[PDB]
Write a protein that binds this ligand. Structure first.
Ligand SMILES: OC[C@H]1O[C@@H](O[C@H]2[C@H](O)[C@@H](O)[C@H](O[C@H]3[C@H](O)[C@@H](O)[C@H](O[C@H]4[C@H](O)[C@@H](O)[C@@H](O)O[C@@H]4CO)O[C@@H]3CO)O[C@@H]2CO)[C@H](O)[C@@H](O)[C@@H]1O
Ligand SMILES: OC[C@H]1O[C@@H](O[C@H]2[C@H](O)[C@@H](O)[C@H](O[C@H]3[C@H](O)[C@@H](O)[C@H](O)O[C@@H]3CO)O[C@@H]2CO)[C@H](O)[C@@H](O)[C@@H]1O
Ligand SMILES: OC[C@H]1O[C@@H](O[C@H]2[C@H](O)[C@@H](O)[C@H](O)O[C@@H]2CO)[C@H](O)[C@@H](O)[C@@H]1O
Length: 338
């Protein structure tokens, strides 16, 4: 029947009108990411009323009524004391992808063609507006429709296309067929010490820009890479290759029992202790039963409060998967626990 942590999330973080609010920002923001994760969780929980409430808010307030015609603006909130509105009209493609996947899986599982039609239109718009062929790489997913592509340099975010979602989307043909391959190579090629970067640049005639840099780190974006990989179905033939490349994050977490806040991608040097959400995010990733139980204790004893949006959503994914609240099939479909 119910998923208690999701029920609490609805009460503490989602407005009556269907917007996920990050309370830690003075502008009391909603992001397209937060909306997209709420759609996913509502679908996993078999919660069509909240799915629809969140979807309608997203459509009307981020997408000018129709995500098939307008990619959702990524940031919304208090712009001035008399104006709650879009704060940045640019898209975030990780959210766009999670919205598209959630609509397509809701349409399939709830047998609702309206969701399928909207998911298809949004997917097509993602391909049109934030997928480009990068010389040397092929088709790649940009992090947003503006701001990440210049004539000779591009910036990517390895957390933005979960491998299981890339595998699911290949059913729609190109560019998704090729994007699944370029995404897999992105993940393998940009983790030279086994740590995936938050953001990474590719430069024409030069390749991936992996030199040591205080900004080339596995942090609050890339923690999601390990989470997505951990939640891949074991029968996905590529899960093993990704676990093997990212194994240093598992070995480092097991060593002192603390997920690092930031790891230098070029040197593997860690700094800081990650929040509880990082512990939960590694639950599906850690294959060793003892290392995973150490992190489980931290999530149990330091479960995120109502002032911790990001750790809460990482916990709904990571603890949710740890509790069998949802699974992915080998093709990246939702295998629901309804
Ligand atoms: O125009 C001046 C300047 O713009 C640069 O492009 C910007 C672009 O204007 C801006 O919209 C975009 O903002 C990103 C933001 O940095 C990013 O953090 C956010 O990502 C979401 C995502 O959903 C998350 O899951 C995770 O990434 O965090 C947030 C949600 O919390 O997405 C927005 C939208 O893409 O950043 C661009 C690059 O900085 C130009 O590059 C520059 O040349 C110009 O000078
Ligand atoms: O016109 C564009 C869309 O506007 C939607 O209404 C928004 C209001 O314009 C906005 O003033 C209000 O802001 C709220 C905020 O939701 C709430 O969390 C905060 O505490 O108080 C603010 C001020 O009341 O948000 C709503 C959306 O939540 C229309 O609903 C929509 O149809 C229309 O397309
Ligand atoms: O880009 C990753 C991610 O950051 C989230 O907020 C972080 C923030 O990056 C960090 O500066 C702050 O100190 O802690 C929080 C998380 O505990 C943000 O909420 C996400 O939407 C964003 O995707």
């Amino acid at each position: 029947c119910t998923w208690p942590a999701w029920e609490h999330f609805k009460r503490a973080y989602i407005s009556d009108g269907g917007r996920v609010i990050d309370p830690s920002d003075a502008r009391k923001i909603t992001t397209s990411e937060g909306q997209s994760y709420a759609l996913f969780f509502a679908l996993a929980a078999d919660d069509r009323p909240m799915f629809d409430n969140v979807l309608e808010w997203t459509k009307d307030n981020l997408a000018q009524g129709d995500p098939g015609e307008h990619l959702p603006a990524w940031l919304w909130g208090k712009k001035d004391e008399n104006n709650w509105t879009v704060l940045d009209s640019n898209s975030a493609s990780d959210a766009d992808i999670w919205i598209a996947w959630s609509l397509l899986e809701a349409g399939r599982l709830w047998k609702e063609a309206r969701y399928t039609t909207l998911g298809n239109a949004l997917l097509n718009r993602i391909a049109k507006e934030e997928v480009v062929t990068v010389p040397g790489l092929g088709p790649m997913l940009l992090p947003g429709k503006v701001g990440f592509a210049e004539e000779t340099v591009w910036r990517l975010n390895p957390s933005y296309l979960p491998p299981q979602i890339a595998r699911y989307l290949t059913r729609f043909g190109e560019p998704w067929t090729t994007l699944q391959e370029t995404n897999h190579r992105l993940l393998l090629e940009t983790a030279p010490k086994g740590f995936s970067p938050d953001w990474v640049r590719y430069e024409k005639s030069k390749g991936w820009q992996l030199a040591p840099d205080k900004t080339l780190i596995s942090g609050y974006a890339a923690i999601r890479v390990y989470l997505w990989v951990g939640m891949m179905n074991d029968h996905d033939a590529q899960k093993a290759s990704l676990l093997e490349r990212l194994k240093p994050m598992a070995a480092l977490t097991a060593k002192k029992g603390v997920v690092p806040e930031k790891v230098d991608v070029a040197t593997a040097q860690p700094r800081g202790d990650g929040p509880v959400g990082f512990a939960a995010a590694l639950l599906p990733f850690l294959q060793d039963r003892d290392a995973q139980a150490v992190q489980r204790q931290k999530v149990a004893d330091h479960f995120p409060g109502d002032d911790a949006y990001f750790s809460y959503v990482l916990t709904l994914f990571g603890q949710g998967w740890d509790e069998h609240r949802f699974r992915f099939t080998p093709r990246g479909e939702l295998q629901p626990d309804w």
